[PDB]
Design a protein around this nucleic acid. Sequence first.
DNA 1: AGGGTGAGTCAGGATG
DNA 2: CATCCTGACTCACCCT
Lengths: 70, 70
Amino acid sequence: KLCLVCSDEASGCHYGVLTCGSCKVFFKRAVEGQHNYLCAGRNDCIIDKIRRKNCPACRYRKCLQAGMNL
Amino acid sequence: KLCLVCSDEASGCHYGVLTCGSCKVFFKRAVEGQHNYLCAGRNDCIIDKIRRKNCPACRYRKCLQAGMNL
DNA sequence: AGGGTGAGTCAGGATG
DNA sequence: CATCCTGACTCACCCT
Ligand SMILES: [Zn+2]
Ligand SMILES: [Zn+2]
Ligand SMILES: [Zn+2]
Ligand SMILES: [Zn+2]
């Protein structure tokens, strides 16, 4: 069972998609919050257990593309 | 520790009252749907883990008497 | 990051 | 067969 966003240990199927606890709370905070997410690279960053902190923009984009939805 | 409605092991404070999980959802289904239950005894049926299924009418009365409420 | 509680779903048993 | 009632499982939100 791996998080379809960051490949960390999946806890269940949250907001329609198999994901870990951190990606669950990240996504909800991203949808509802006011954030200024901008990628410092090419909108194609590697998202894994460590790197996921680096680019919220690409993390959020991957959540959306994997089909996450409130 | 014990459900105030059927004396089974309580799982938490549900709808205002210390109850087991099954009495929790029993009550929720009784207050939203119809609760036109008939007791086949004398309205004092024994409600315990083994017998709580026999008399929804007496089970529902014990939920109300214990103070359960949405 | 995790406990507490509400709510949806599913399957199984009893019933018709 | 189908329908109804039950309770365990899973996930939601809220607060710490
Ligand atoms: Zn993740
Ligand atoms: Zn990026
Ligand atoms: Zn109970
Ligand atoms: Zn009764």
